[PDB]
Symmetry: C3
Subunit: 450 residues, 3 copies
């Protein structure tokens, strides 16, 4: 919706509010089928130039079928070591394992006899929406076979060769993508499922009309957060599972936390201590708690809405937001790391830029027609994106976002000035406020008595 | 083979045994050649529609040849900065450098005159298996040239255009893959080497029949662990090196170590200390030592066999396995890291799941038809995958593996309860058992005397 | 130019000198256009086999146009969260936003009426070089429309179908690449901009003739460091921005720093302390300071010249090079990390190899015809690449570079021997020389008085 931003001068951090959530909590498994033809290379004294082209494409069709056949034994055998990869495709893997039953292929075979798509109830109680997106069996048996399976193969047609190359192309590219990916691809490509097929797949999913609108206006993100698992190739059918994300958390407030090192600015470069707020990234309200995503690369932002996968998240108490308003609060122990690294750096936020300027570094903010409009002093500062297009830190040039929104500069004393440098734990990798004050109380006790 | 798993309650870790090794220790370099035709665009008043299509494809053929020509000067000039990338392709780079000798191209030119494949002994003593996978020279000189190199270009045939587009397509895609990858691609694509060519290449390699069976049943993994280096384009031949992995360690025991944070469970959230075993990942017996792979992403698991590259490994003493049976043993100094991070998390193993439940986090294990079957208490626990399909930690839902195997719950007192929190080094990034006990003895000496 | 290397035995580090800089400081935005035809599927009793092929390709053309149309609304809405991704494409995003003005498309429409390329001055004062690389509008309206828009569709030509599939192929692949990448692709593919178009684009850019030579001889690197942003599809034109890098720092000295752990070699494995120089990677002189690139993967080396992006850099004082000649100098506080991790490892440099051999590890350097020529003792050592091709550490085999250059073995006492192990801070994650000596002075004060 409307994006706001608050910069906290005391902790060298900023929070971008106003975002809406779209967190994946479920999966929908669809069975995409390709009707195939099994045939044998028949001896024929092929002498017609159109015959040689058909023979070459039939070999490419058979080679694909053969590779897939090898791959059918590997896709259930791949993995098993555990981890995040196996847990992400377990819903689809469970469907692939059911399609290995004798009954099961026939059942989707019978449901797709009259229609291209139909809902099938599998033996494991999973109701899947089955698609038939390519019918190579009917094309090979109706056009290629009568033209080929006579004693004189010289009969042919030039438009039949071009059309067969057109239809067979998708099978070769689906084979190619499944070949180098051991049967599990992500994102789901157009060869794996076209946009018209995906939009038709979304419209028939057992989801609300609001979720149909959401997934149809964010197809690119839906494809990225989806998996395609190769299942089987038996009985004249090629079947693979397309695993679509289900967003069980929608329209809850999200916010992104930006952090930058906060150091003292003494002239003596060796007497400077630093601290940095940890756990930067996306936060979203979720089921009375907060879903925290440490790797912001796992979330996708599309028009002020944040698409994330819950498997890449940590569940934190709602009191974690207190670190943005009062980092010394006792409800939640806010985490910081310490250093003596007085190296300048910048962080482009949603509506501005944080600048940690230290040493002799030249840190400015410029407008391309007006020039330098702000010069950052030693320490941690912030500039809005209004009237600014460039931030320069040292030899590197950053560009601010030109998005609309209000920024609030929350003035405050930098908390690094509250610590005695002679007693400050300078190299804490993953500490907290109470942790640092605990060590400081330990060291201040030995000196006070002796 | 048969997978087992032991969970160590005392150290919040689990080991998955029963895997077999396939570690890459060598390389095999093959020279893949493409016979090319050098020609000049001849003036011709092309007025026949089939002529324009031939002219367009000839330009695409020439453009490719030209780009490759630029790329021939860059592939030996690329890199040189050192590191893992240069060491991985050094065998192939050494072959590319020999193909720049005047004699050398001719030598593979003469060996492939009568056959598509032949073994050639290069000047640097390397015996390579050379393939001729595409003969564009013979097709352009036998079909395109007689039809084109007459005063009347209007002679043409429609099947000749389609067949030339078919043959020339591989050269354009090989050119395209080498173009954006600076001449070094991985995995090796089907355009670079088809499956039938690779299976034929494996069957003629100077390896044992057991290794031929291994590489033929794991083609996808073989392709992934292979490199393709562009060598040269001179004298009517395009030559590039395909670098296949050689597995010198086979069928030795491998095991995967899973770790999770182990914390105390006091009601006061600030008085809790944590430790976590480091060096999670794959371990494999190798030449009297243990090959440890810190980045488990570098290994590929296929039906209980672990394919890894030794360049992504560390060589550890065999006593490193003592950390799984007795972490306080003096033979090997087991490594741990310390924190006060009481954040809940789960680890999906091969046969179960480790759960580190802390704070107010809701941690359960469920069956989709039976419901919640186990509720994890505060601390580090474990559940088998038998009868379980779901583990829920906070707002995130994990899926267990449904693989077959026996799990053993090794009961034991959590070792974190043995440490006095007032003297525990809380923020050790990469310490060890004796390191922590060393610091504790240092601090306990100052207080005992005064 | 000519590469040299110095190994510092005292600090277990090496510097590779002699490289030349090519650092990206600017961007050039070009507007690549594709003239499109908007049409409606006209009712026609298509019965001619060539008609069905035209109808199938027209649907693929329309489907692409439709997807792009969805994508036009998403590319300005994608992102906005800030960070490095938004700052990299801000120049192109600013051009895409101007092309949404009513006047603007027409203006590039009028400039490309007579020529394929022309310079256009946009309303935002940006002078862009506009290309027209594909004219599907003229082909559909001149060939497909007269053949299709008669009452008898049965008129057709077979070469028209093949040529339409050829022209339409680029639009489908441009659509495909923009589809899965949310409108921002990198590197820029051949479909997005061919090599002949890029070379012609470089030759007409407002840059010096020396920079035209540089970018033309390093096209692969130029493509990698470029972005393609989808802009708009309105008014019969498809327009996207190709963002080319501008190298504002050229031919300044660069050098690469290699580091490896430096430990004591006591027989008792628990009494060993270690230190490691941090901030390994590329350094380049830049504007009186030094541009440091922590992630060496962000730089590309081509024939002794280092292409890097300044956005992936830190700006350091020129005194940072003093850590290579005197790590105890007071001008710059050299950074180190400490450990007790006596695990062996090797680092392949530009002209040799650093070996940190500890414990029982077998560390050798071999020649494939002569055998083992050097055996590394406990500690940190180095070998040149002259006469050496293999370094073996434990079970892993590294290959040295065969590049030409002089190596200098700077003998010196390892600085780890200067520290008392009983007072050494063993687990410092990101400390420095003065930091370690500061803690040592703190601990040596308590014991000396009592």
């Amino acid at each position: 919706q409307n994006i706001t931003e608050e910069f906290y001068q005391s902790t060298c951090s900023a929070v971008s509010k106003g975002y809406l959530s779209a967190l994946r909590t479920g999966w929908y498994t669809s069975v995409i089928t390709i009707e195939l033809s099994n045939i044998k290379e028949n001896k024929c004294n092929g002498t017609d130039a159109k015959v040689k082209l058909i023979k070459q494409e039939l070999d490419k069709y058979k080679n694909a079928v053969t590779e897939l056949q090898l791959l059918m034994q590997s896709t259930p055998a791949t993995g098993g070591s555990g981890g995040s990869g196996g847990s992400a495709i377990a819903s689809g893997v469970a469907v692939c394992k059911v399609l290995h039953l004798e009954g099961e292929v026939n059942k989707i075979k019978s449901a797709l006899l009259s229609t291209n798509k139909a809902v099938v109830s599998l033996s494991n109680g999973v109701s899947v929406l089955t698609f038939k997106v390519l019918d190579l069996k009917n094309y090979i048996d109706k056009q290629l076979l009568p033209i080929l399976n006579k004693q004189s193969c010289s009969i042919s047609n030039i438009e039949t060769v071009i059309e067969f190359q057109q239809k067979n192309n998708r099978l070769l590219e689906i084979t190619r993508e499944f070949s180098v990916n051991a049967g599990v691809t992500t994102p789901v490509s157009t060869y794996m499922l076209t946009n018209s097929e995906l939009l038709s797949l979304i419209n028939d999913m057992p989801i609300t009309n609001d979720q149909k609108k959401l997934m149809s206006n964010n197809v690119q993100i839906v494809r990225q957060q989806s998996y395609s698992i190769m299942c089987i190739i038996k009985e004249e059918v090629l079947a693979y599972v397309v695993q679509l994300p289900l967003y069980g958390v929608i329209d809850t407030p999200c916010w992104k936390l930006h952090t930058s090192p906060l150091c003292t600015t003494n002239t003596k470069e060796g007497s400077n201590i630093c601290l940095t707020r940890t756990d930067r990234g996306w936060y979203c309200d979720n089921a009375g708690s907060v879903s925290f995503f440490p790797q912001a690369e796992t979330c996708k932002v599309q028009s002020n809405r944040v698409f994330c996968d819950t498997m890449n998240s940590r569940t934190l108490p709602s009191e974690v937001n207190l670190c943005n308003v009062d980092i010394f609060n006792p409800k939640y122990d806010c985490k910081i790391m310490t250093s003596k690294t007085d190296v300048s750096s910048s962080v482009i936020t949603s509506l501005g830029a944080i600048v940690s300027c230290y040493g002799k570094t030249k840190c400015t903010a410029s407008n391309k027609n007006r020039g330098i409009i702000k010069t950052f002093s030693n320490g941690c500062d912030y500039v809005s994106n209004k009237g600014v297009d460039t931030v320069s830190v040292g030899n590197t040039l950053y560009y601010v976002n030109k998005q609309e929104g209000k920024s609030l500069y929350v003035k405050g004393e930098p908390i690094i000035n509250f610590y005695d440098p002679l007693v400050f734990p300078s190299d804490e990798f993953d500490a907290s406020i109470s942790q640092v004050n605990e060590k400081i109380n330990q060291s201040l006790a030995f000196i006070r008595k002796s």
